[PDB]
Ligand binder design. Structure first.
Ligand SMILES: [Ca+2]
Ligand SMILES: [Xe]
Length: 240
């Protein structure tokens, strides 16, 4: 999160940290959302690599004991059958993870709320992005969860020449583009929370930013549109 601020310890309890084993430690690599006691939603491109993955819930500071963490292994990975690592611009950047154990729900660990199928947001809707990702283009991961105010940019505007052009599709959400605030590497797979009818729901899965840099004027952060994938998500959980 570029141009973010520190989120309160209990503001976004469905946020998780996806980490892989490295030697004798684990490294953070991506965010995700807890959507079931034993199921996580994240980005497909986050699990392209055949690593050993674990999930941490109730996490706030990556390199210090918070006293609230729960650590669970990933037992099965289901990526969207249409996803293509050589073509993120094509969409379908979404995956579901089954955990080896069911986690315990509390004030720091809660299920994310999903929008209803087909739901589209108005231009300039109020949303927040959260994550432990790079705080600067080519910078460093953050230690504590960050948040940034990121209002949507509707399809007709985001798909115009001065913005992303044909690179973005209707199965994506655009947010930001102000040159100051944005997603960045290591935020991917995490939630975009949007306020709808007085409740925060997860409308997006962080997918990509411009190759020119994370916070670039007229190049909003691009998210997978969750509301496009509700049937698939339900179908997967009911059969696994
Ligand atoms: Ca910690
Ligand atoms: Xe990103």
């Amino acid at each position: 999160v570029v141009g973010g601020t520190e989120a309160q310890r209990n503001s976004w309890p469905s946020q998780i940290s996806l980490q892989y084993r490295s030697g004798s430690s684990w490294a953070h690599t991506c965010g995700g959302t807890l959507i079931r006691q034993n199921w996580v939603m994240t980005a497909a491109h986050c699990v392209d690599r055949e690593l050993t993955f674990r999930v941490v819930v109730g996490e706030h500071n990556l390199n210090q004991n918070d006293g609230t963490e729960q650590y669970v292994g990933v037992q099965k990975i289901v990526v969207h059958p249409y996803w293509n690592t050589d073509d993120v611009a094509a969409g379908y950047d979404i995956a579901l993870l089954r955990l080896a154990q069911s986690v315990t729900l509390n004030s720091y660990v809660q299920l994310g709320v999903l929008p209803r199928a087909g739901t589209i947001l108005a231009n300039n809707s109020p949303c927040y992005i959260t994550g432990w990702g790079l705080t600067r283009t080519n910078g460093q991961l953050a230690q504590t969860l960050q948040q940034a105010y990121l209002p949507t940019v509707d399809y007709a505007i985001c798909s115009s020449s001065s913005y992303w052009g044909s690179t973005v599709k209707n199965s994506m959400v655009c947010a930001g583009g102000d040159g100051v605030r944005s997603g960045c590497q290591g935020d991917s797979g995490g939630p975009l929370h949007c306020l709808v009818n007085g409740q925060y729901a997860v409308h997006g899965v962080t997918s990509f930013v411009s190759r020119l840099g994370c916070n670039v004027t007229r190049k909003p952060t691009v998210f997978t549109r969750v509301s496009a994938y509700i049937s698939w998500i339900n179908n997967v959980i009911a059969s696994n």
